[PDB]
Amino acid sequence: KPHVSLIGLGNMGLAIANCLIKSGCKLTVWNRSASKAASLVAQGVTVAATPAECVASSPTIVICLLSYDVTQQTLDEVIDLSGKTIINLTNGTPQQAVKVATLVQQRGAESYIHGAIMVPPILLGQPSSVTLISGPKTAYESQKELLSSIGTTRHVSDDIAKASLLDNALLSIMGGVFEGWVQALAIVGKAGEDEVDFAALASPFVKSMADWLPRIAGHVREKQYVGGSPLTMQLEALENISETSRELGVGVLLGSMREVMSEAVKKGKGGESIAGLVPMLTELDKKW
Amino acid sequence: PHVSLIGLGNMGLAIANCLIKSGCKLTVWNRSASKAASLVAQGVTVAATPAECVASSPTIVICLLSYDVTQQTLDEVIDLSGKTIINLTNGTPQQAVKVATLVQQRGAESYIHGAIMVPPILLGQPSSVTLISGPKTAYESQKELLSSIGTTRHVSDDIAKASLLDNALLSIMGGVFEGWVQALAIVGKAGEDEVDFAALASPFVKSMADWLPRIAGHVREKQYVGGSPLTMQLEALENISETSRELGVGVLLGSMREVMSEAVKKGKGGESIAGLVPMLTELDKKW
Ligand SMILES: NC(=O)c1ccc[n+]([C@@H]2O[C@H](COP(=O)([O-])OP(=O)(O)OC[C@H]3O[C@@H](n4cnc5c(N)ncnc54)[C@H](OP(=O)(O)O)[C@@H]3O)[C@@H](O)[C@H]2O)c1
Ligand SMILES: NC(=O)c1ccc[n+]([C@@H]2O[C@H](COP(=O)([O-])OP(=O)(O)OC[C@H]3O[C@@H](n4cnc5c(N)ncnc54)[C@H](OP(=O)(O)O)[C@@H]3O)[C@@H](O)[C@H]2O)c1
16 A cells, blocks of 8 residues: 555546556545546545645655646646656656656656556556556666556656657557548548448458558668659549548548648659658658 | 550559459550550550550450549540440549449440559459449459459449548548658657667557547447547647657648647537547538
């Protein structure tokens, strides 16, 4: 029954709380909306009135808030972190991880590790469900056992910023997948198809796309841009998705993809593979 | 078995090589005739014109860039009497109906539309699925020939269906690529190995793949309540932009940020990803 504090009782915060409770720990919680602790009071959880009193209560602080900005606001009056390990499970950018690591260090925190939970709340605590962890190996190692309450942790690096870097990279893929999937479902739906039957038909094709991704990552690393699926042809197919959508009276996502491919053609990269879009991104700070 | 092919691009040349490998008597036409050079050794006949290529065989395969190029290339093909047309040219549902009409008007026996769902290098593998729509009988007749490009799947008697499902599947592919390109740009600029990243990512991408049928049920059942609201997802998309700015790396997923923003405005911030589908079905708009 080690003492753990948890800041944030949102969708993911509350799933974290339940995992930590089941693990057999003595849990102090704080949330802006204290009512979100209501389902935890019966399970023997203490609700601290302020972030400060919450952090005082335990040597191990878990944070799972909306964002860095909300994390900075919440930690504002948390003056004393002596002998505390911070486990930050708040989505943010690599520098935001470094910024919170710095905020808690300046306040006497013993250590900081950052975690990206890669599943929705309902999956938290399945050994299958993976959380990526970055920060000092000894710090991970001391929290490993507690952290096993939320599923399998993968320590990806000693660098505090890395779990967030990989988080942002993986959420990029997820964002792209959902954008395409939502566009796919709007088209088949409006045209009077059953979305569940379409999904059964799509799943084998979506698995093939997943299997082509490593080959593409190799192409990117080796700057090998020639294949049988040029950007000119792919752009023509995206334009037909727009027209297909228009024909049905449905809206059109993938605009950034259309824009970056349109410009790619302009710069005489029209004959390159999808791997050729990566240098379009790495060489220019722009929102397509 | 006499087959005519119109189009010797990346996919057209792969089709040609499948049809040769399966013992067709191939006649070809392409705007750039030189693209038939690898086929002349193998005994293929090059026709001077679309008309003379179509004239040469009972069964016509078309694999051109677009509908526009197809109608422009069929401009002086005025006699399809006796011809069965297999159109493997990507296009809209309405374009498939237009070519079917265009080719009927000129005397074609029948017309089927197919959508090849693999790159040329995988064409001819039984694992490679080409969606076919059109008359069952017309498909039944061509099924044997088409076995050369892999496994064909007759999705509907309705000519427009292969192109409907094609556009739907290519939407997913374009999203997946958009995401992957963003991910690779981010981790590459950060000094990570793209191939080691891909190994790490693989389990996670397969997991996303598995989530999609559930989301389809949510869309059909109009069930938009879960533990992953759009406000939370938008916040994460915004962090991908800032992560990218930190690295001096460009950012895609613009239409995804935009539609989620409007969702939040319309009071749908609490909804799941499934709550985006009605944002699209309601309004003709580019996001
Ligand atoms: N599917 C998921 O839910 C999921 C999956 C993986 C990772 N994550 C990550 O987990 C983190 C939390 O996500 P969530 O799903 O728990 O989101 P959520 O349901 O929106 O909860 C957000 C949390 O942030 C707090 N908050 C927001 N604005 C605040 C403010 N201005 N001042 C103080 N507190 C504020 C909320 O307090 P109130 O309760 O008072 O609103 C709540 O505790 C995010 O960074 C997210 O990306 C989530
Ligand atoms: N490549 C793939 O991975 C892939 C996968 C699945 C489906 N497809 C679909 O298959 C079709 C063929 O794609 P592809 O990869 O063969 O594209 P491609 O390599 O761009 O070839 C385009 C073909 O259309 C011809 N063409 C273009 N503009 C023309 C014009 N104005 N007049 C006459 N002919 C013209 C080209 O002639 P020239 O040779 O003279 O330029 C060439 O034969 C497309 O609809 C595509 O979406 C492709």
